[PDB]
Design a protein around this ligand. Sequence first.
Ligand SMILES: [Mg+2]
Ligand SMILES: [Mg+2]
Ligand SMILES: [Mg+2]
Ligand SMILES: [Mg+2]
Lengths: 338, 338
Amino acid sequence: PFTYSIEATRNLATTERCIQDIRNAPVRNRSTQFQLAQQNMLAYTFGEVIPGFASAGINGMDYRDVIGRPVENAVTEGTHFFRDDFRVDSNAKAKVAGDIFEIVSSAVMWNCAARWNSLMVGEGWRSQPRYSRPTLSPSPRRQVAVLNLPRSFDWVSLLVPESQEVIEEFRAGLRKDGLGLPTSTPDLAVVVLPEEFQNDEMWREEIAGLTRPNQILLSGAYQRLQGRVQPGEISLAVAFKRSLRSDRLYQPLYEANVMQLLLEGKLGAPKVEFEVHTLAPEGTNAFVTYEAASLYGLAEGRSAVHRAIRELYVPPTAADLARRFFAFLNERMELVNG
Amino acid sequence: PFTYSIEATRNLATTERCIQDIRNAPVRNRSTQFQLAQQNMLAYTFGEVIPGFASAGINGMDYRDVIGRPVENAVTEGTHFFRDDFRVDSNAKAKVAGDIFEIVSSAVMWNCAARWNSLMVGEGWRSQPRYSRPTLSPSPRRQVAVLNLPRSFDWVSLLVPESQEVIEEFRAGLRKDGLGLPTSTPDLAVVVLPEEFQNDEMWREEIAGLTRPNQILLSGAYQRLQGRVQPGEISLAVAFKRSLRSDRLYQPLYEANVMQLLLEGKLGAPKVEFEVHTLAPEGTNAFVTYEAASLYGLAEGRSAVHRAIRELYVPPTAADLARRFFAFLNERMELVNG
DNA sequence: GGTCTTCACA
DNA sequence: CCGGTGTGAAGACC
DNA sequence: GGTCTTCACA
DNA sequence: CCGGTGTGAAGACC
Ligand SMILES: [Mg+2]
Ligand SMILES: [Mg+2]
Ligand SMILES: [Mg+2]
Ligand SMILES: [Mg+2]
């Protein structure tokens, strides 16, 4: 659980434990001995707790301490089972911490979107944790879906085929000369729910924990909307980064530049709302560096110039992130007619 | 020395040693105990040896083995001095190794440029190591300068003022709307020698080793060329990266895109030659990703489309790097009138 | 076609 | 995915 | 001035 | 500046 019960760890299967001993099964070019099964620790620590929608002692806890509990629970378990032999490299912890931060933030945003959809359908406003009720007029057409994009996802398959044809032709013309348009997958994307799923109940209910079925449900939700989202319904794109460095911050800038070039220069979309979340921006000047012009149309000067990154946000708590997302939805869905 | 002489380490002053004890002088927010003095290790290991311009055993040695000698020499010294207490974190070693790679490669390129200039001012072709003599016609107007750019360098101050005013006006127009154009400084830049430095004897003499005076000479050779280089004499720009990851390769792409936007779309330069030098590209797909198009001129598609990165190079030895640079000089400076 | 082993992505 | 660095320029602080 | 301390960059 | 990582998908293999 969230507090490392000893009896709960005892009653786990060997394949369900947070740490897997692979000392007798080495990896090809790695010297790993004990590996961190991040899905197991997500199901263990957050199996029945979702930050921001849990007891008030977890919703107000520092967000740096909520993201960082699974790793220390794993360390405790590994020390219990493999005493004086347990050792996990710091780089493994860094990777797993980044992944856990992204997944937990996505789960919080999913619960917020589920509450918003339940309100919009006209089923009242839930009040188990106290959040401000939006002033927007309820309407089923103003429903959203939060998609956790996979590793090598190009995010163009979410567009309608008539919107994919232009992108395909442009990429084929680029390939004719042997060139390409590589990009990293944005961590998250929020889109308006298509007209066919306006009655489905899977977009109206909240998950009680990050169990393995719920992890699969959250991870596989992108496949339901493939080839269905209009180009103008891409509400928000989020790039999570648990920590920033003066050189590591250029990856989201490149992702945003490529996405805006594809969505604005070719599809005529109004604008792309790309933002970056972080937990420790100290030691850098990201608040000024991210105040950068989009590398699209600068050489011609015929379109309006704007920031490539909408905003850099540092959530202190999960409840603050939930409130920010609710305010963003209330502000954004106003201009969409329904 | 290059092989960790014990008597040579005994003769070093306490401030000239490869490892500094800062256990009694902690840093503000770091837990460092022993610090790797990278300049001291550079002066110790390569104080009388330059790879590619030394004995045939060092020239033909694996480049991954030359880049990595200073770190292990420092580790041996630290074990000798602080036994059973010495410990250096792997991240410090990674940082130092990257810096060593960049600096030694820049030194090799500087020696190649010095020999090229000495040949092209009609002083003959040095032959202590055997390299192919270029077939180009000698002329003083074709000498080159290799510049190791420092951190937070604008690299536009190298341009003549008339060229600088265009970039300044563009940046002021960007700033008026509250925007900006941030970038990282390319690790190196090769430019044609200005007409006032043709008769200088500093650009023809090679260095015997990476002693501290030579380090200062190579690091500070960019101040001499501020406001002298025309916007069309930027021959080559090189980004050094010891190893490539599937996300760390997007920072050179951003650097190249910004550089080409500034030089091709705002100054009328023919083309910018940007290439990446790596030692371990295994584990990623970089020979295909780096085969990408420039995010400039694709909004309307009027100018010809070309690659952002010229080539990704993996040098096996230092002699191969010297030969590549000589071939590049012979091929490129042929198109300079005179 | 079905199970295992490896590799790129992030 | 990230976290631990070495150094040169800017910043107190008399 | 000018000397020691701190911070951002890469 | 970089090196040690977990996982899903593609590649062998009677
Ligand atoms: Mg990602
Ligand atoms: Mg991310
Ligand atoms: Mg650099
Ligand atoms: Mg570099």
